[PDB]
Design a protein around this ligand. Structure first.
Ligand SMILES: COc1ccccc1Nc1cc[nH]c(=O)c1C(=O)Nc1ccc(N2CCN(C)CC2)cc1
Length: 300
């Protein structure tokens, strides 16, 4: 029926890696900056470690590990391994610039049309991969897209991924709890809106209980000032009542790619092209000796 999931679950030793500092915290626990130096490989891999102990919380963190180890794409956050301490630790690739939501907010005056459209292509690619792997994300947002380098973003948070965030949810999802890859398209449309507005909160001030009826009436998120009808039309198509009428991720890759070839024709930003963002060809962009990124460190 279904193909056997031959993914390898890597078990890392507590002594094999160290916690440098705290990146962010919440209700789940906390995410630490860290370094992983495996066995005797003469490599230092920059990592992010996701840390009360209870049997049900450990099932939830192990389910997230299962899903995360069962993915491999340049625009998806893969699980490097797990550490079997009192409470299970998830070891993932360090995405130094953090989430895209906080990134667009903090760097607005330096974010141009090329970056914005390149991000859209990259998220669509990552999402289309999840669709190929028959994986419904169920929590796509600009807060769940991480920045490796300003020119490379990846999809994260598989704590909801299967084979509530109302303001990102499709109408069928709010009303009937139906989650399809076309419901992820709605969440993608909201994500694009989050980027195009440089981090605005969707339906700000409106309570989540009012959203259901608002979408039912025919109301949608407004057109960002930088958005041409071409880009907004896409966002709107992601928000159709008929899930089948919404675009497919493979089409979103195509659409945003054509636009990324001539970004100034599709996004009107004041002082565009003269805008600068960190590049791997910059001064002190990165002990430092023997540091390899996880994307270049393959197999045990
Ligand atoms: C799976 O856990 C997550 C779910 C949703 C969003 C983020 C994460 N955490 C992950 C998961 C994997 N890799 C990472 O690097 C992270 C992560 O959060 N990294 C991360 C987060 C924040 C930062 N700073 C960016 C600059 N800012 C001013 C201060 C914080 C740096 C790295």
């Amino acid at each position: 029926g279904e193909a056997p999931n031959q993914a390898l679950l890597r078990i890392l030793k507590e002594t094999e890696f160290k916690k440098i500092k705290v990146l962010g915290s919440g209700a789940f626990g906390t995410v630490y900056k860290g370094l992983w130096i495996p066995e005797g490989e003469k490599v230092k891999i920059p990592v992010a470690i996701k840390e009360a102990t209870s049997p049900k919380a450990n099932k939830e963190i192990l389910d997230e590990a299962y899903v995360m180890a069962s993915v491999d794409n340049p625009h998806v956050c893969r699980l490097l391994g797990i550490c079997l301490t009192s409470t299970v630790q998830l070891i993932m690739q360090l995405m130094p610039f953090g989430c895209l939501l906080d990134y667009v907010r903090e760097h607005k005056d330096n974010i141009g049309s090329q970056y914005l459209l390149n991000w859209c292509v990259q998220i669509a690619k990552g999402m289309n991969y999840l669709e190929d792997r028959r994986l419904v994300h169920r929590d796509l947002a600009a807060r769940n897209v991480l920045v490796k380098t300003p020119q490379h973003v990846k999809i994260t948070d598989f704590g909801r991924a299967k084979l509530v965030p109302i303001k990102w949810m499709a109408l069928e999802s709010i009303l009937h709890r139906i989650y399809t890859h076309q419901s992820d398209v709605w969440s993608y449309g909201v994500t694009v809106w989050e980027l195009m507005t440089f981090g605005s909160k969707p339906y700000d001030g409106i309570p989540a209980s009012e959203i259901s009826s608002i979408l039912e009436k025919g109301e949608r998120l407004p057109q960002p000032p930088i958005c041409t009808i071409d880009v907004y039309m896409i966002m709107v198509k992601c928000w159709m009542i008929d899930a089948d009428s919404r675009p497919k991720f493979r089409e979103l890759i195509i659409e945003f790619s054509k636009m990324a070839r001539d970004p100034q024709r599709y996004l009107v930003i004041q002082g565009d092209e003269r805008m600068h963002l960190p590049s791997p060809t910059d001064s002190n962009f990165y002990d430092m000796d023997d540091v390899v990124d996880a994307d270049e460190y393959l197999i045990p």
